[PDB]
């Protein structure tokens, strides 16, 4: 298997609108092209760019179709040494 791994400090650098990455349940998503398409707006995503956004994502109560959309933006897994307990 060719799984690509990123450290959290690499993800932390894509925190602006020119290249926007986010972590959700331990996977890294490049959502740069989705910013303007997101139904909840681009601001709530930029506030969380470069970070683990799992709790906000789940707190909103996203639909099954929103979960499906993730797959388009998947680029890699968070290195296991950087995942918290």
β 15-16/19-24 pair status = antiparallel
Q: H-helix or E-strand containing 3?
A: none
List beta partners, residue 5. Answer: 77
Among 10, 66, 79, 82, binds ligand HEM (CB under 6 A): 66
Whether 79 has a binding-site annotation, put simply, is no
60 near ligand HEM (CB under 6 A): yes
Tokens of 26: 């331990």
Rule CB under 6 A: which residues touch ligand HEM? 22, 29, 31, 38-40, 44-45, 48, 53, 56-57, 60, 62-63, 65-66, 69-70
Q: Residues annotated as binding site?
A: 38, 62
């Amino acid at each position: 298997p060719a799984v690509t791994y990123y450290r959290l400090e690499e993800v932390a650098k894509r925190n602006t609108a020119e290249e926007t990455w986010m972590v959700i349940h331990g996977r890294v998503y490049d959502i740069t092209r989705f910013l303007s398409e997101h139904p909840g707006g681009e601001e709530v995503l930029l506030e969380q760019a470069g970070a683990d956004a799992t709790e906000s994502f789940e707190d909103v109560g996203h639909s099954p179709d929103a979960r499906e959309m993730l797959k388009q933006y998947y680029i890699g897994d968070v290195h296991p040494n950087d995942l918290k307990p």
